[PDB]
Structure formats: C-alpha cells, structure tokens
Amino acid sequence: LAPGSSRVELFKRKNSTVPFEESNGTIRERVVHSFRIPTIVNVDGVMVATADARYETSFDNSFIETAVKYSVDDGATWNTQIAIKNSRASSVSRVMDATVIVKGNKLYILVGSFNKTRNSWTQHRDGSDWEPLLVVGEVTKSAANGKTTATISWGKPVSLKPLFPAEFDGILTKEFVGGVGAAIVGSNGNLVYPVQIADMGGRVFTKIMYSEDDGNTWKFAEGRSKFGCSEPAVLEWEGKLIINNRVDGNRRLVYESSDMGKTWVEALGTLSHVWTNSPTSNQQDCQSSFVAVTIEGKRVMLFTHPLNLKGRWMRDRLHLWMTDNQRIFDVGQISIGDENSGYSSVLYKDDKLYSLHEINTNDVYSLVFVRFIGELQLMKSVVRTWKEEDNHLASICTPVVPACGAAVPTAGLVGFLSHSANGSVWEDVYRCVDANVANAERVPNGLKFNGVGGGAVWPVARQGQTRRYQFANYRFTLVATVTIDELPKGTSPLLGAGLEGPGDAKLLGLSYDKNRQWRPLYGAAPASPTGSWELHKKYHVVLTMADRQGSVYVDGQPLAGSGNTVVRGATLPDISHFYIGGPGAPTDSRVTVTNIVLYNRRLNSSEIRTLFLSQDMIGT
Ligand SMILES: CC(=O)N[C@H]1[C@H]([C@H](O)[C@H](O)CO)OC(C(=O)O)=C[C@@H]1O
Ligand SMILES: *[C@@H]1O[C@H](CO)[C@@H](O)[C@H](O)[C@H]1NC(C)=O
Ligand SMILES: *[C@@H]1O[C@H](CO)[C@@H](O)[C@H](O)[C@H]1NC(C)=O
Ligand SMILES: *[C@@H]1O[C@H](CO)[C@@H](O)[C@H](O)[C@H]1NC(C)=O
Ligand SMILES: *[C@@H]1O[C@H](CO)[C@@H](O)[C@H](O)[C@H]1NC(C)=O
Ligand SMILES: *[C@@H]1O[C@H](CO)[C@@H](O)[C@H](O)[C@H]1NC(C)=O
Numbered sequence: 001l002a003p004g005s006s007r008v009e010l011f012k013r014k015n016s017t018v019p020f021e022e023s024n025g026t027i028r029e030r031v032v033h034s035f036r037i038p039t040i041v042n043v044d045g046v047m048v049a050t051a052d053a054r055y056e057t058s059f060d061n062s063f064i065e066t067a068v069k070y071s072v073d074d075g076a077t078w079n080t081q082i083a084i085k086n087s088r089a090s091s092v093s094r095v096m097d098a099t100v101i102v103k104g105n106k107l108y109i110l111v112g113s114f115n116k117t118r119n120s121w122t123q124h125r126d127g128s129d130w131e132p133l134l135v136v137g138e139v140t141k142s143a144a145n146g147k148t149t150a151t152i153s154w155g156k157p158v159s160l161k162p163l164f165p166a167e168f169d170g171i172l173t174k175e176f177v178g179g180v181g182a183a184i185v186g187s188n189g190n191l192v193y194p195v196q197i198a199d200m201g202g203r204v205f206t207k208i209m210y211s212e213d214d215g216n217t218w219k220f221a222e223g224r225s226k227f228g229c230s231e232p233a234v235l236e237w238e239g240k241l242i243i244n245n246r247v248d249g250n251r252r253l254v255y256e257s258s259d260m261g262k263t264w265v266e267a268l269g270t271l272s273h274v275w276t277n278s279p280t281s282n283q284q285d286c287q288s289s290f291v292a293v294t295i296e297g298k299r300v301m302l303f304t305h306p307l308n309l310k311g312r313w314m315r316d317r318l319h320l321w322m323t324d325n326q327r328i329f330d331v332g333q334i335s336i337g338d339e340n341s342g343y344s345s346v347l348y349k350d351d352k353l354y355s356l357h358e359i360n361t362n363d364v365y366s367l368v369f370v371r372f373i374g375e376l377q378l379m380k381s382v383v384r385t386w387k388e389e390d391n392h393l394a395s396i397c398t399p400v401v402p403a404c405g406a407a408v409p410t411a412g413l414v415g416f417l418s419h420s421a422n423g424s425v426w427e428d429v430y431r432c433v434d435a436n437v438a439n440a441e442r443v444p445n446g447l448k449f450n451g452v453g454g455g456a457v458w459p460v461a462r463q464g465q466t467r468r469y470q471f472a473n474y475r476f477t478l479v480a481t482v483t484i485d486e487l488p489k490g491t492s493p494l495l496g497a498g499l500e501g502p503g504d505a506k507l508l509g510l511s512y513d514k515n516r517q518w519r520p521l522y523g524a525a526p527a528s529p530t531g532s533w534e535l536h537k538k539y540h541v542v543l544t545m546a547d548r549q550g551s552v553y554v555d556g557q558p559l560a561g562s563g564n565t566v567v568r569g570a571t572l573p574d575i576s577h578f579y580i581g582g583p584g585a586p587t588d589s590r591v592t593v594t595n596i597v598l599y600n601r602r603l604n605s606s607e608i609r610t611l612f613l614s615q616d617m618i619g620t
Helices: 373-393 605-614
Strands: 006-011 017-021 027-031 034-043 046-054 064-071 081-084 094-103 106-114 130-140 151-154 171-178 191-199 204-211 229-237 240-247 254-257 289-295 298-306 318-323 328-333 346-348 353-361 364-371 413-421 425-428 435-438 440-443 446-449 455-459 476-484 491-499 506-513 518-522 539-546 549-554 575-581 591-599
Touching (some): 006 046, 006 064, 034 094, 034 106, 034 346, 046 094, 081 106, 081 130, 081 151, 094 171, 094 191, 106 171, 130 171, 204 229, 229 289, 298 373, 413 446, 446 575, 476 491, 491 591, 539 605, 575 591
Parallel strands (some): 034 364, 064 094
Antiparallel strands (some): 006 364, 046 064, 094 106, 130 151, 171 191, 191 204, 191 229, 229 240, 298 318, 353 364, 425 435, 435 455, 440 446, 446 591, 476 591, 491 506, 491 575, 506 518, 539 549
C-alpha cells in the first residue's frame, strides 16, 4: 500500500460480531466466519460500510445476511447492524451481493435472495428460489453537545420480481442481480442500477434498471452487454453512462450509452479491453469498483481491480487506476504484498481517499478499511500535471490561417513525449506510458538517434497485462517533428504502428529511402516511393488511422495512397507498439524526432494544420 497510507481490519473474520436476531426477537451477538462483498459510501457525512456477513463459511451458497457498520467520525468509531435478514427458509437461505445507491439521506440497497439452492445462480433450473430484493435505509444524523450521532433505520425489503420481464428480445429470463457495489444517481436525478441477468440456460448479461420516481417504479432499459458479461459497475461521464463489465475468461468489456441504457456502444476508443483478470487473461475475473470523483478541480474516474498474478480466485495485488477517459494512470497496489485481496470499494469524502476491500487467507475473508494518504497525494500530483499541460497547450496562440488561430488540440490528447528524457526512457509528459529508448542522444524536445537499433518503443500490446493504449487498434493520430540526418543505404523506418505477430508487420507507418523519397506503409500493401524530402530539413509527420483506414501526412498534406484500407476483417488489429526511428535487421535509422503526440481519435484536417502550424510552440 502507499508509504503513508494505512489500514485496519474493520470487519475481522472469526472475530467480529453482528447482532443476529433470532426467530422470536432475541438478538444475540454472533461470530462471523467471513465478511465478503464490501461497499463503503458517504450518506450525508456518516460513513456507511455494507457487506455479506457469511456466518458459517465463505461459500456463496451458505447462510448469509447483509451487515452494516456506519460512522459519524471518519472511522474513529463504528456501530454495527444487520441491514437485511434472510428468509431463514433453510440452512442456506441468504441475501447477498449488495449493489448500493445513495440519494440524499437515503440508502437504496439491492441484493439477491435465495432460499435453499446449493448450486450457483446461473445454473438454476428456473428462478423459483430467487428474488431480487430492494431495501431502503434513512440516515438520521442528529447530534448532541459537540458530538454528532446518527441512526439508520432499515425498512422491510421489497421484492422486485413482478417487474422483471420473462422475455428480453426473446431471451428467456431466469434471474437477476445488481452489479455489486456502488451504483449512482444520474445527473437527471435517476436512480440507476447496473444489473446482471442470467437467461434460462446460464448465459449471463448486463443491463441498466433505473428509476425516475425515486424507487417507486423500475424500468429495464433497451440495451445490453455481450453474453459473458457479469457484475457490471457504472458511473456517469459527460452525459453518458459508462458500464464496465466483469468478464470471466477474457478481457474486460466496456460500453457507453447516452440514453440511459436504451442503446449501448462498445467503448473501443477508450476503456474497453484495457483491463483484465490475469496476465494471460483466461482466469475467472473479479468484481471492480468504478467511481466518478472530482480531484483538484478535475473529474476523473477511479477503478480498482487485482492483478491476480497467482490466478484463479486468489486475486492478489489489488490496484488503483485513475483516468480522464483519455490518459490512464496506475496509482499502485492498495493491498499489502502478495496477500490475496478480492472485491474492493473506493470512497472520496471531504478530501480523503479510502478503501474497503477483501483480504483472503485460506478462504476465510476479512474487510480492511484503508486510508489512502499516499495514493491521494500521488493522485493530486498527476491531476495537477494534466490540468497544467492541457491548459498550457490550450493557451498557445497558434497562427492565423488565411481565410490567434484555432487552439492546439488537446481533446483526447492521450500522451506526449517531448523534452524530458535520458539514455533509456523518453518520459510521457502526461505521466502514464513512457517510451523505451536506445542508441539516443538528447536534442531540444526530443532525441537524435544514432546506432544499431537506435529508436524508441512506445509499448502498446507490449504494455502487457493492462493495455492502456488499447485504443490505437480502433483509431489513432500519431504526430511528430523530424529530420533525416543521414541517407539510408536503402529504405529505413521513421515512425509507425507495428503489428504483434511473426514477421515484421506494420499497421500504418512511414519510412524514407536512398533516393530521398518517402515510403508510407499502408497495412500489407507494398511501400512505393512518393515525393521528395531534403536531408536536414524539418518535417511534420502525422499518421492517421480510423475506420480500418490509414493516411500519412507530410507538412500538413497527405501523401499518395492515404485513405488506403489498412486492415481487413472484423477483428481489431493487435498493435504491438509505436516506433519512433528505428528501434532482426541491424536497423540504423539516422534521424532526429521531437515532440511526439498521441491521440485516441482521428484528428481532422484543420486539426492537423493547427499542429503543423504550431510545432515549434508545443514543446516542454
Ligand atoms: C450469486 C453468486 O453466486 N454470487 C457470487 C459470484 C457468482 O458466483 C459468479 O460471479 C458467477 O455466477 O461470484 C463471486 C465471486 O467471488 O466470484 C462472489 C459472488 O457472491
Ligand atoms: C479480535 O481481534 C482483536 C484485534 O487484535 C484482538 O484484540 C482480540 O484478541 C480478538 N478477539 C478474539 C475473538 O479473540
Ligand atoms: C427467543 O429464542 C431464543 C433462542 O434460543 C430463546 O432462548 C430466547 O430467550 C427466546 N425468547 C423468548 C422470550 O422465548
Ligand atoms: C423464500 O422463502 C420465504 C420464507 O418462507 C418465502 O416467503 C419467500 O417468499 C420465498 N420466496 C422465494 C424467493 O422463493
Ligand atoms: C532514465 O529516466 C527515466 C525517467 O526519466 C528513469 O525511469 C530511468 O531510470 C532513468 N535512467 C535510466 C537508467 O535510463
Ligand atoms: C475540426 O475539428 C475541430 C475540433 O474538433 C473543429 O474546430 C472543426 O470544426 C473541425 N473541422 C472539420 C473539418 O469538421
């Protein structure tokens, strides 16, 4: 966990007590084997932590009730209750998997309820022992002489089953549950719940169940995920709802929707497929928290997920990520060493960052309450860097084009390599994904390469487990200022996006040859000379790839062949990295490149001219 940060075993396995109330009223303090499925929120000043209180064993299909522990002193002190009771219909009756919403001084909890099944939910024969329960709680935060206090009265639970269609587009429905963890209140005031639906047969999938009348009605919105998507999380971004899904056996799928879920678009230019369940991505996946907060004047999203280096359900190394839907920063591990963590929750309150997440030892589970001093600190530092640079760049008077000129483009400006560097790392100005460097010597705002393999590699698939530049495969705009320093024996590489796989494939890219012509590479079509360039002279290159199409620009003008289809078929390309210069063959590209900019969209033509018109102004 960050140096400075700390934690406390808030819901301690086999130690902590919950007031279990017997059939006939008596209430007894009772030990609880494992506490799993945490969520901690902030109802009007009073901290609320909800969880599965699994009395006898950690297994899903045993006896479970929803416990809370709220507080009015930022964790100094804590009270404990049992928010929802199970039916008590057998020795496995349970309510679980709370998905929580907070509006005003009310808490709307949504849990799955089962009576006697001993197998898990997707494999049930019908939905007859399952019920979707809605429960509301109200925080009453009265005080007393320099000492606030508070109560939470919980209401009888209400079943949502009569409002669940038997059919979705002809998909027979079996059962549903909320996504797990915190959901939200829409900026339009709706109560929105991401929910996971199992059909008759075990296919699972995701949807938005919302309320525009504070709890009284619920509507199942038109759109859905792909099959294999479960435990969705949700937040609102620039008028849109963004739904991050858990995906067993594959990479995490992300969808955006602008109509409260009526239509879903897969977020291929931003967050989809970036995150995953294990280095090899074929393991069971794991719940995540995905929360919109404002830090240092700026709205970012916050995302938690373990690396699972150990695999299966160990869920070691919980991580924390922060993104503005453009850049993605890895804050670090919020958990200690090789401990096995699990489902987590993050909460920003009165300028303090916190977490409530699982720890697992021999499958007996605890919930730790963590204080993110370190992380927050680091988080502000980079939000400061994003604002700081966005604004700078957005404040450069670029030249007026014969019709101050249009702004330097910063929207979806993902990364940028300028002046800061050394012999083996060109650093990202937006502090997220640096460049790996070789045989280079510094020049203002960039590197002059010279030597076998001199160039730089901006990891794309080579990034590894988490793939933060996953976007390039859908669209990108790669920009750079260059000169050719020495003529090439034949043809050498200048700037590109090269393909994972055997051989030496490139998606789109540009090279120069012995004749002083440019050789743009458009997918697998063979390079063919075009134009003229003059050693030493400064050129503005921009490579552009969208709609499976590519274009290359020199001096704001597109070279011949631009627009050529660059990849065939439905699968997205798997870009390995972007190359600057000439990072098998002993490639010695003798060039100097400076100020490389990266965008998650296809900049436009006037946008490209803005950059061409202002490249001697963007540098750090
Ligand atoms: C209803 C239920 O089974 N809940 C469990 C869920 C589910 O089992 C699985 O995601 C696929 O059905 O999994 C997990 C889990 O740590 O993986 C915890 C949940 O409590
Ligand atoms: C519960 O754990 C606490 C934390 O250290 C400790 O004080 C105490 O020994 C434990 N009580 C039990 C049930 O043994
Ligand atoms: C309620 O149930 C418990 C369970 O053993 C019993 O001992 C308790 O005193 C009961 N209360 C009454 C008044 O029966
Ligand atoms: C489950 O059991 C309870 C307790 O008797 C019953 O009233 C409830 O309605 C049952 N319904 C389901 C979800 O099968
Ligand atoms: C080079 O600089 C980067 C950050 O600028 C740093 O991570 C690296 O360790 C430095 N030194 C080496 C060995 O390249
Ligand atoms: C180019 O895009 C910029 C910003 O996204 C915008 O100002 C301008 O209207 C666009 N021009 C075209 C060609 O649509």
